[PDB]
Amino acid sequence: ASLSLAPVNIFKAGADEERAETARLTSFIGAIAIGDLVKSTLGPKGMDKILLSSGRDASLMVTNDGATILKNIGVDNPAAKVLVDMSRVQDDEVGDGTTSVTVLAA
Amino acid sequence: ASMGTLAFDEYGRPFLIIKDQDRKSRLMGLEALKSHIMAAKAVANTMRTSLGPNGLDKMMVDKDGDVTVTNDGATILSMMDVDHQIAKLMVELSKSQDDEIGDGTTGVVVLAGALLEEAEQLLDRGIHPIRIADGYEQAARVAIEHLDKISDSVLVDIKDTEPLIQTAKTTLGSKVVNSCHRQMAEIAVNAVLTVADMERRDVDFELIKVEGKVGGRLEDTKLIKGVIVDKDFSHPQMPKKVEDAKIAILTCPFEPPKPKTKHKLDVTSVEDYKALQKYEKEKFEEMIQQIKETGANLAICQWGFDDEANHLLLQNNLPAVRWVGGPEIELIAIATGGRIVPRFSELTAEKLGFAGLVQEISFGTTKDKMLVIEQCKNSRAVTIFIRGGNKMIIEEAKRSLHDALCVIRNLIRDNRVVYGGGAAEISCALAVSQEADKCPTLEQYAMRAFADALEVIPMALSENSGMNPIQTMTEVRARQVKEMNPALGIDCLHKGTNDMKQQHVIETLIGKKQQISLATQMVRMILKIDDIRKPGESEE
Amino acid sequence: MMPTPVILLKEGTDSSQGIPQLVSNISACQVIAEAVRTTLGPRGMDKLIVDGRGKATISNDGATILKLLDVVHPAAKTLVDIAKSQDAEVGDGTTSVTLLAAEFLKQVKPYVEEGLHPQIIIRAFRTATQLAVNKIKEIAVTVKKADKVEQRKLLEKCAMTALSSKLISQQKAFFAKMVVDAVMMLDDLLQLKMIGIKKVQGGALEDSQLVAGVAFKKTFSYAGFEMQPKKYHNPKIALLNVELELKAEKDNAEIRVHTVEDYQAIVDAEWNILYDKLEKIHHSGAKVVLSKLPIGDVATQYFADRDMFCAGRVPEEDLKRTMMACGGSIQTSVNALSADVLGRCQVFEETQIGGERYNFFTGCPKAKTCTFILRGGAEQFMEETERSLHDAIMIVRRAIKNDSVVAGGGAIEMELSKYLRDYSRTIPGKQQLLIGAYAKALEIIPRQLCDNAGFDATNILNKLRARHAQGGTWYGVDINNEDIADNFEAFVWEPAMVRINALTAASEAACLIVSVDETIKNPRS
Amino acid sequence: EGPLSVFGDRSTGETIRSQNVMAAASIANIVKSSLGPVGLDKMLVDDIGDVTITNDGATILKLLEVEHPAAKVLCELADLQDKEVGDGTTSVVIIAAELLKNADELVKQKIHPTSVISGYRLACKEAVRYINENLIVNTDELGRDCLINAAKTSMSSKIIGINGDFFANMVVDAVLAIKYTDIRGQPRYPVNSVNILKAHGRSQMESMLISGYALNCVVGSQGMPKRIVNAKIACLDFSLQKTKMKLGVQVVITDPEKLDQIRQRESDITKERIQKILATGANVILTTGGIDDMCLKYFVEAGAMAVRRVLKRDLKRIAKASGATILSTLANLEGEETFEAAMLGQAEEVVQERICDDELILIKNTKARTSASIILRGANDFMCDEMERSLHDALCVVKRVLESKSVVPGGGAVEAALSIYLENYATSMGSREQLAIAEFARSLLVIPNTLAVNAAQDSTDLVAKLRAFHNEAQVNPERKNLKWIGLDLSNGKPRDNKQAGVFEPTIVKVKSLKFATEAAITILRIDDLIKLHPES
Amino acid sequence: TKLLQKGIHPTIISESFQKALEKGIEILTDMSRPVELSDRETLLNSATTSLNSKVVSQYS
Ligand SMILES: Nc1ncnc2c1ncn2[C@@H]1O[C@H](COP(=O)(O)OP(=O)(O)O)[C@@H](O)[C@H]1O
Ligand SMILES: Nc1ncnc2c1ncn2[C@@H]1O[C@H](COP(=O)(O)OP(=O)(O)O)[C@@H](O)[C@H]1O
Ligand SMILES: Nc1ncnc2c1ncn2[C@@H]1O[C@H](COP(=O)(O)OP(=O)(O)O)[C@@H](O)[C@H]1O
Ligand SMILES: Nc1ncnc2c1ncn2[C@@H]1O[C@H](COP(=O)(O)OP(=O)(O)O)[C@@H](O)[C@H]1O
Ligand SMILES: [Mg+2]
Numbered sequence A: 001a002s003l004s005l006a007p008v009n010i011f012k013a014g015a016d017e018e019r020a021e022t023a024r025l026t027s028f029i030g031a032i033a034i035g036d037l038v039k040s041t042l043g044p045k046g047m048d049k050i051l052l053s054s055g056r057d058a059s060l061m062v063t064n065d066g067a068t069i070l071k072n073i074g075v076d077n078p079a080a081k082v083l084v085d086m087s088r089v090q091d092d093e094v095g096d097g098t099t100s101v102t103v104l105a106a
Numbered sequence B: 001a002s003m004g005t006l007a008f009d010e011y012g013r014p015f016l017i018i019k020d021q022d023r024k025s026r027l028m029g030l031e032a033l034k035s036h037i038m039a040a041k042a043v044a045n046t047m048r049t050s051l052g053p054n055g056l057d058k059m060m061v062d063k064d065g066d067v068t069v070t071n072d073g074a075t076i077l078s079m080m081d082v083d084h085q086i087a088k089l090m091v092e093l094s095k096s097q098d099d100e101i102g103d104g105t106t107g108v109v110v111l112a113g114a115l116l117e118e119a120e121q122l123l124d125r126g127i128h129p130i131r132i133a134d135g136y137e138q139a140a141r142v143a144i145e146h147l148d149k150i151s152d153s154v155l156v157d158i159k160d161t162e163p164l165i166q167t168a169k170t171t172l173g174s175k176v177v178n179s180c181h182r183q184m185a186e187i188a189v190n191a192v193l194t195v196a197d198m199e200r201r202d203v204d205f206e207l208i209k210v211e212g213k214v215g216g217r218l219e220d221t222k223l224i225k226g227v228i229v230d231k232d233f234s235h236p237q238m239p240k241k242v243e244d245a246k247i248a249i250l251t252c253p254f255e256p257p258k259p260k261t262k263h264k265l266d267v268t269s270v271e272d273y274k275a276l277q278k279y280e281k282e283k284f285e286e287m288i289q290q291i292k293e294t295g296a297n298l299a300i301c302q303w304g305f306d307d308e309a310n311h312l313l314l315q316n317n318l319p320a321v322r323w324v325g326g327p328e329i330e331l332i333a334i335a336t337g338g339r340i341v342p343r344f345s346e347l348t349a350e351k352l353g354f355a356g357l358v359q360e361i362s363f364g365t366t367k368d369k370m371l372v373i374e375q376c377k378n379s380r381a382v383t384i385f386i387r388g389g390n391k392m393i394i395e396e397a398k399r400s401l402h403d404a405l406c407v408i409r410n411l412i413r414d415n416r417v418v419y420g421g422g423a424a425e426i427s428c429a430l431a432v433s434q435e436a437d438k439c440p441t442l443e444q445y446a447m448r449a450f451a452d453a454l455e456v457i458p459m460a461l462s463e464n465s466g467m468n469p470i471q472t473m474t475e476v477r478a479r480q481v482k483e484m485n486p487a488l489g490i491d492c493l494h495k496g497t498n499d500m501k502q503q504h505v506i507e508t509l510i511g512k513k514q515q516i517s518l519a520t521q522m523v524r525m526i527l528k529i530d531d532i533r534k535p536g537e538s539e540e
Numbered sequence C: 001m002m003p004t005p006v007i008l009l010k011e012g013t014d015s016s017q018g019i020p021q022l023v024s025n026i027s028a029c030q031v032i033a034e035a036v037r038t039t040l041g042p043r044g045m046d047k048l049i050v051d052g053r054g055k056a057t058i059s060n061d062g063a064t065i066l067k068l069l070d071v072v073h074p075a076a077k078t079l080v081d082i083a084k085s086q087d088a089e090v091g092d093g094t095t096s097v098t099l100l101a102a103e104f105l106k107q108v109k110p111y112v113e114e115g116l117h118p119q120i121i122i123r124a125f126r127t128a129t130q131l132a133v134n135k136i137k138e139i140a141v142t143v144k145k146a147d148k149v150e151q152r153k154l155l156e157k158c159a160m161t162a163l164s165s166k167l168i169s170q171q172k173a174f175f176a177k178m179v180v181d182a183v184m185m186l187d188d189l190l191q192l193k194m195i196g197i198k199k200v201q202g203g204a205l206e207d208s209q210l211v212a213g214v215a216f217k218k219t220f221s222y223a224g225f226e227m228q229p230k231k232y233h234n235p236k237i238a239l240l241n242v243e244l245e246l247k248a249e250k251d252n253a254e255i256r257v258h259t260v261e262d263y264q265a266i267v268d269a270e271w272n273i274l275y276d277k278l279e280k281i282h283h284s285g286a287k288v289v290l291s292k293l294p295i296g297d298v299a300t301q302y303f304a305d306r307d308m309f310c311a312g313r314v315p316e317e318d319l320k321r322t323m324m325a326c327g328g329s330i331q332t333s334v335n336a337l338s339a340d341v342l343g344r345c346q347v348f349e350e351t352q353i354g355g356e357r358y359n360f361f362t363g364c365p366k367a368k369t370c371t372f373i374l375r376g377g378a379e380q381f382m383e384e385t386e387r388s389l390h391d392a393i394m395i396v397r398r399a400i401k402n403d404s405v406v407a408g409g410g411a412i413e414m415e416l417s418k419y420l421r422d423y424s425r426t427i428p429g430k431q432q433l434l435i436g437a438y439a440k441a442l443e444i445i446p447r448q449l450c451d452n453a454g455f456d457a458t459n460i461l462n463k464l465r466a467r468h469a470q471g472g473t474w475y476g477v478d479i480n481n482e483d484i485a486d487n488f489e490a491f492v493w494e495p496a497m498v499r500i501n502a503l504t505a506a507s508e509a510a511c512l513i514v515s516v517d518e519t520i521k522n523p524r525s
Numbered sequence D: 001e002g003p004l005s006v007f008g009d010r011s012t013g014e015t016i017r018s019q020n021v022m023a024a025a026s027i028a029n030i031v032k033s034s035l036g037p038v039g040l041d042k043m044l045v046d047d048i049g050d051v052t053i054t055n056d057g058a059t060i061l062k063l064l065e066v067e068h069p070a071a072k073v074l075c076e077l078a079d080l081q082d083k084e085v086g087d088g089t090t091s092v093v094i095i096a097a098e099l100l101k102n103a104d105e106l107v108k109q110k111i112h113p114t115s116v117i118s119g120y121r122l123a124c125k126e127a128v129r130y131i132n133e134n135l136i137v138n139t140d141e142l143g144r145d146c147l148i149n150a151a152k153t154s155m156s157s158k159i160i161g162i163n164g165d166f167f168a169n170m171v172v173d174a175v176l177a178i179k180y181t182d183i184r185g186q187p188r189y190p191v192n193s194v195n196i197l198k199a200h201g202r203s204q205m206e207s208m209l210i211s212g213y214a215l216n217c218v219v220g221s222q223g224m225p226k227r228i229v230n231a232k233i234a235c236l237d238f239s240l241q242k243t244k245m246k247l248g249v250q251v252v253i254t255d256p257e258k259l260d261q262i263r264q265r266e267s268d269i270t271k272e273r274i275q276k277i278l279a280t281g282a283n284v285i286l287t288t289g290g291i292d293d294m295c296l297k298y299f300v301e302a303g304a305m306a307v308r309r310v311l312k313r314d315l316k317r318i319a320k321a322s323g324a325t326i327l328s329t330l331a332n333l334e335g336e337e338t339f340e341a342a343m344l345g346q347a348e349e350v351v352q353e354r355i356c357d358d359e360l361i362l363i364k365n366t367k368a369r370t371s372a373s374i375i376l377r378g379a380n381d382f383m384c385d386e387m388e389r390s391l392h393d394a395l396c397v398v399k400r401v402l403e404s405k406s407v408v409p410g411g412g413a414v415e416a417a418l419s420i421y422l423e424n425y426a427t428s429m430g431s432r433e434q435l436a437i438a439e440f441a442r443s444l445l446v447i448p449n450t451l452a453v454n455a456a457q458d459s460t461d462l463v464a465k466l467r468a469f470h471n472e473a474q475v476n477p478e479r480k481n482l483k484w485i486g487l488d489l490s491n492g493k494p495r496d497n498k499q500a501g502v503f504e505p506t507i508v509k510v511k512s513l514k515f516a517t518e519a520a521i522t523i524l525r526i527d528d529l530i531k532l533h534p535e536s
Numbered sequence E: 001t002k003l004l005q006k007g008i009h010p011t012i013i014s015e016s017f018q019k020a021l022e023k024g025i026e027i028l029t030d031m032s033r034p035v036e037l038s039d040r041e042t043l044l045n046s047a048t049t050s051l052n053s054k055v056v057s058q059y060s
């Protein structure tokens, strides 16, 4: 059968379990969303993004740096979180390639 | 169906027996067993897709949204937010397999789920669940003895590490770190061989420090026959490399002494003040002079120190580390051959450790520094430094290497090895079928069911590898019966041969025996339950 | 009724009075019995209860099950209480007591419904209870030979019986050997605190073990503990109640100095105090050191340098077991550490047991203690294993003090039913019905065995009534054959005190429940 | 729930059987306290202050608001006993509940419900046979006092108990009055043709038996006489009102000079009909329809008594009793409209009688048949309703005694004898059906047990003495006269009830057993229950 | 359920079930014996068998 689509639900109120096709669906759409977000900043004619934070300070940033853009976004997709952490690690290792790695993974 | 006792007295007077009987639930009899079996079947069918080299991973998200990608059944069922008590029993089962063995955490769950799935049909046919549990116990005894029978032995010496690298590679075949398969297996082997009383005695994993740092490549993961610390030298102008380092390990902060008892030193005159002043000066100088006179070229404190001590260390050419943790202090002592000193007066040239290299290591554009201590003579401690492109693969590599270390440990405890690829399960299923042909008719259905359940691991391996379960399993079973060869299993990697003894697919005999024993015992405790009474309140 | 201007009791007082109240009490007791019925016997099942916190408990033990049921019925609380009392005085029979009490009530329900005065019923119950108790004391088999092999056989069989209903029945011979080995080591009070029961998750039941010595889990070691050795081949053991670390010499102590030389002297004095304690501990010859109180990092490293072993924060019970096994005394002061107060074992080790680190003191020949180390795949698996072993251990203790055995499978129940039927056929005719009802009630144990096993309880009870009326006293249910059998020869042995106390408690509960004629619930504040 | 996914609850196995038994037991405990000469009455308050006092088990279970189906079954059982017999409505419920109780006890012991049902069916058959063969008394051997004794036994436990000494006479007389013979010359006693009126006021002892008929009606006009001696009675099933043209008839005037005559016929038509009636000699005219004031004036001037809105059943009874013919129309087979004096009935008197500020009509000494009315007189409407119900039970009992001329003794005699005989008879039938038949036997004892319990006496001792007597009767052929022994609840001692006069119609006990057995079997077959949530 | 688990296609299961159905129709036809409607005893026995399962079986 299946964990969720079973006659009895085996989970606490609020949990969930995306199976084979639904899992790859969420994963691919999230990663590709992250990638399509961070591209268009790629290359000499790349354009910047605005990081209009909604906090009580409403910090404002204008960046073409993929690492900063991905750090400063509220992600809820786990695959997108993976790509975000990957760009952060790229920024730590070297100082360039965070958008190239993000776009490549996507 | 539920709601415990419902009568409300024949006379018409209130009938209240249990507290919140109206809010409480209860399931009795065969329907309770069927609910248990469905829950276990769901858990097992979730896990069976993470089984074998071609097994896939699961991405767990915690309460605060952190992601963990893993193939480890124990880690999955621990990260899994279950509310069904039978699912909790299966989580406990997998955790138990991890505690005792450190591998098999996914096989146990699949096998227990299969045993209960077969008990479902046996109960449908009308057999008492206890008779099912007893037939399963009997068949489990048969399979355990048959494992002892078909088992093989491997050499656990440090001169021929190939059987151990093969075992560790089999363990790490199913994990994401098989991209550096042998590189990972080798170091797991060397780790357990470095830290072990190899007289078939224990392996203390506290002597293996598994450290991870984002950055680098998986290929950079390595074994340091020594220690790594997340600290740097105390002063920024000290040297970043020390060769032939004589180490003084200290748990005394380089600060003026202070009694533990409530004390009040009274200053009553300018002379008392000047005496205090020079006392402080002379204490700092005397500490540094005591550290120098022992001959040390490096100091390692546990409790941090102050500006005067730091500058005196620099001035006297004494590189020094501060704020090292108790466990790291212990590991440095064990590795360098040094003794931990609580005060400077007790410091001597013999209590010092020796490290052939103490280095400060950078990590690119980070500002983060680490301290490596290595090239010790006979370090009984070791570190596995893991690198990678994201924290997910680093943590998965950590747990995968833990599996490999536990496997090498189990080899050091018992050198006997059974051959995997589902071959051991097929052979045990054959043995149980044979012994069932001899028992009285009624415990024969339960032994045949145990055999059909043992056959779920080969089916799962074939299925995850795209093969047809029934076809492949029947063919390899027929071959096993004809040519006596309990090394015939599922070619998950499609190397052509079905002979796992040739493919170097190796499991530990204690591992398989523990899988079988744990699955059978927990299936017994589950079939023995026929009533449930949850709070059922749906509270907050 | 009418509404008074000033009512007598507080508004909300619920009073149930008369024959309906009594029949309702009996029905509540029937409910409580039903809640544990299916746990009876080798074919018995376990119950899973879940608390408000969401923690599940799985048990075959009737006392446990009833403790977990949040029973609030004043009359049904009595069955819970008598199951508790059974677990107290004996340790087995908790389900049998509840079944017997509820069946007494069920059997007298018809006569209660037709207005029979309860005093008559309680008189009949008291009479039949005395008769059945004296009959058990009369026909109980007590071998008067004091032979050691037969006295170990008897305990082994009684333990196997007490365990042939649990999830460890498939190893019950195994566990029975250990249980006897366990209780045959305790000295004269057979203290349960003198038997240690550790639960190490991971492993199989057969991987469980008994250590004729002591074992306890590693206790929050400091730095240097891995530099210590972990095996000793004839160690002397210093058991202490001593905090070994740099500390305020006293909490109400205040040092006052006016000189840096005095300051230095005070610092060195603290250090010399500690080092003096450590030097006394070291010169006593003790290579192993255990403290009920912490042992600091300084002391840890000190003992590591002297090639000694140290463990602090050891629990009081584990310390007393180490004492009773190794043979020393616990010292709050280290100033007189003679070999008289030091302990000794043939082997000390620290090993890994299923993810945990455990210290084993093994080889103690003068040991008045044993330690069970139980393996299993779940906290509740191991907990029910512990409960099963507690049943077996209490059984073995009671048998040691009185080796007077009867047979099980309902053999004794059928014999007492026969004797009481016979007795009832010789009395006027009012007590006749009630004592015959007592007799018919006693039949619930073999009946429930057959039910839980999946037989035709009617036919089997007919066979038993016949074989017990033809001559034959230990014939009861044979479960694996779905038949009857001489259970005394099949070795289904049960200490007589078990059934004696079961009848006593069940009859007392029935008499109490039947004497209540009114229930008055006051409103809760 | 779970796998099924049905939108409802499901009880299964011992649970639902226990529930069914609890429900039946509840219903039986409701009525147990109202059984026998020592049973007591019940109040029932209808959530609005409407009060009902009663001892009738069928009435009690009708007024209750029951939700459980296993309890609705017993309510319907009491209703069926009340329809088919008229007595035994409480005993049948108690017996069905006890059969359910013991049968569920057997099913708990894992005797299959089919076997319990087979045993119950066998025991019912053999109990019926044993009654019909050994426990019946012919009322011919006893005469008329047998009817009085049966009436008194039925009236014991009611509010006309101690006065039975006199009420039974009335009851017996009433049935004898309404006796009529049909084709095959078989005598039929169609009670519900005895009229029963209630009138609070004078004591019960002043209740009246009218040889004739009593109508809860009065004359239509205060100018009419209120007593007529040589009553010639005309029973009409049509109304005497101003004539209205029917739906498909319209008056359309095109010459005003005709309008007057048309209006005049609207009344003269009715006048002519009344004149025809009065032309025959009819002094009393009862009609199911209405009578306009215009017509009442004709009756007034003729010296006649007209009564309107009489009930069809009262009219049928007055017609049958007086010799009259109910006419729906004054129309003959000759296409004209006339009224013959042969269509009249006769009666030696018709009066408007005063009864506690409320008048009724009394038709006394009708010829062509005797009829019967009973005016019950008590302290208030509650008592009067209880008296009506008690009297209906007594009338039904006397009717059954007269149709089938067999009676059985009371006081638990029949149940004790059957308990003995069936506990001895079970030994021959199977091994499990044996247990079922023994339990049927033991269940039958719930009647004397309950009688003694209600009398506040030692049920155990009394029923044991009963069974001892009846065993002596069934094992000693010289002592069969002991069969007639049953309970004496005024002294707590067995007694020869055939000589004491405690008789019950055989059909009462027979039907009680048959219906109780079928009800128990019906409920005892349920092993599952699916209670769906309401559609809304 | 278990067939699907083995890794068989629902189409194969359905067709093999049709095969087993045809064979079972053959088998049941072979088992059967013909009857004449005049055989009142066979009719009474068929009706009794049909009624054995129902509440009306003591009245069969
Ligand atoms: N003059 C140029 N002609 C062609 N390509 C260029 C030129 N200058 C820069 N690039 C390309 O533009 C890219 C800039 O990428 P960048 O936005 O820094 O990516 P990331 O943020 O991933 O480092 C580089 O990959 C480089 O190949
Ligand atoms: N290279 C391989 N070839 C064939 N079978 C393998 C191979 N590696 C692992 N397996 C099988 O896959 C199963 C699952 O192993 P793995 O997923 O590594 O750990 P766990 O047993 O904890 O799931 C084992 O029973 C083993 O028989
Ligand atoms: N092997 C056996 N054969 C028959 N009866 C047994 C056997 N072992 C135990 N019994 C019986 O099972 C009954 C209940 O066992 P259990 O429920 O574990 O004990 P208790 O309810 O007394 O705590 C006892 O009457 C005992 O005599
Ligand atoms: N005078 C009497 N003496 C002894 N028993 C009686 C007497 N009158 C009635 N009984 C018994 O009481 C039972 C029930 O009577 P009753 O309650 O009046 O009728 P029902 O059962 O229809 O309500 C009858 O079966 C009858 O045997
Ligand atoms: Mg593995």
Ligand SMILES: [Mg+2]
Residues within 6 Å of the ligand: C092, C093, C161, C162, C163, C165, C391
């Ligand atoms: Mg026991």
Ligand SMILES: [Mg+2]
Residues within 6 Å of the ligand: D087, D088, D154, D393
């Ligand atoms: Mg009556």
Ligand SMILES: [Mg+2]
Residues within 6 Å of the ligand: E049, E050, E051, E053
């Ligand atoms: Mg049918």
